[model samples]
Target chain A: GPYHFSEQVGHLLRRAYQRHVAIFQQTIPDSKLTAAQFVVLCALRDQGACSLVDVVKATAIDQATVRGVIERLKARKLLAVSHRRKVLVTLTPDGRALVEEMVPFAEQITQSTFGGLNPAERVAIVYLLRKMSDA
Target chain B: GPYHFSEQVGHLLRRAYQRHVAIFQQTIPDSKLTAAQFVVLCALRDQGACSLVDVVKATAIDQATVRGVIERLKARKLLAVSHDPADRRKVLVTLTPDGRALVEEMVPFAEQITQSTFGGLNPAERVAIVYLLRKMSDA
Candidate 1:
């Protein structure tokens, strides 16, 4: 018999991700913001000002999607882009306020969704995921 | 100061998934099969014969995607489906020799791709990740 693909790490990882996305959408159903958009906003809030490339690095979102999210956010007046040596992306006041308001809510979603795992398992999962990303 | 969203568990899980997909695409660049398709094939190989709902339950893929994968595989002649007499809604899926041959070739490559991602981790980390993932799915 072949190895069980369902038990594979990559498969389970993707499943966990889908579950997380579903929870995120349920938690913030009214907001137009996607989980990716929320991550971009949080990235801008954390990194201050950065280029599209920087957002990609910070969020691990692909370049095209990152650009699209940035453009969408700009259209929404949630973010502003400035042309320096490189294009710099930053949250406008509205963007900053949205992320700030959503932060606690995001935290609640994370806590409740992952509340199954104890603190140690949570730390371990994050560590392993970061390691996999780097890999 | 707020928690860093980039560093959040859910955010990082998605990033990791994206990274895995990227690697999967690069590993099997020529194949029309997607990562999800590969997974469904693998499930069929392991389980022998099963239903569309069974594949979906086994795969953790959404119902729509699983149905689509099944249809595409069936179109490719890699799989065949027939209605269960007990329930027409249930369709049994079986693999063709073509699929079995493909699976024989694909399994090693799948292992290599997965290995590249996890070769750095110790056994403890692997256990933890699987445990956490199962917990998330269970919840």
Candidate 2:
């Protein structure tokens, strides 16, 4: 009925995603960590040594881009990659320490991005997005 | 404080956007029309013969990418661009009949994508999502 494609859920999701991405890139400018890379780092912090596939599952960054992010982080010595039956990735001390430093900023960006919404709205958004992603 | 970054709103938004992007690409594989391109076409359809600036405002796409999308569509002959006499630098865009025909075909796929995405959610949940996103955008 309303053919305003810009107002569609999918398009709004894209714009919001882009807004968050811009904030993320700004906050962690020096580290050059993308939201995907930060997701990988956070995964390693929580899960310890695991396969790159595991990282892909943890973050929804498709396998292709996840590997590239891992390689770049590996090149920076922030993460280590080992050839086990499946390639295992773990955070280096630098990686661990960097995430520890970066988490606060990540938290800040998340807060500021949704600063307009009340607590209930934030919860609703997360719930809706999670349900939509699952569907 | 649950510190799982994967569960954050921003991360989830990125994933959902990626999911929709994948579906869109698959559905519109032949036309090579991206979601942004579709938005531009929709804008022109709604508001006839507007400037590049007006299209940008309508679609929420940045000027640079909207220009590229316009240029690509122009090349395809689905869109026509002309310079105004009052201001030569002012560029205007309009949809040809062929573009109108193509949009008619695209509407079905767009609806299908949204339907499949929301088929699982109840009406209340759908309302909440739109409300929250609008609030987020407004904020």
Each candidate's interface RMSD: 1.6, 1.5
| lDDT, candidate 2, A8-105, per-residue tens | 78878877887787778887858567777888899999999978778888887889998899889989999998783777889999999989988889
Worst 10 residues of 1 chain A by lDDT: A1-10
DockQ of 1: 0.63
Model 1 superposed RMSD (Cα): 2.8
lDDT of 1 at A66: 92
* DockQ of every candidate structure: 0.63, 0.64
User: Per-prediction RMSD in angstroms?
Assistant: 2.8, 2.7
Query: How accurate locally is residue A35 in candidate 2, as Cα lDDT from 0 to 100?
Result: 78
* After superposition, candidate 1 runs with Cα above 4 Å error: A81-88, B48-52, B71-75, B87-93
Each candidate: what lDDT? 0.83, 0.83
Mark the 10 consecutive residues where model 2 chain B has the least summed lDDT.
Answer: B111-120
> TM-score of candidate 1 restricted to chain B?
0.86
Candidate 2 per-residue lDDT over residues B1-139, each given as its tens digit: 6688877888888878888888788777455888888878888888988898898788767788899999899999989888866789887899999888887778878877776656477999877887788778665
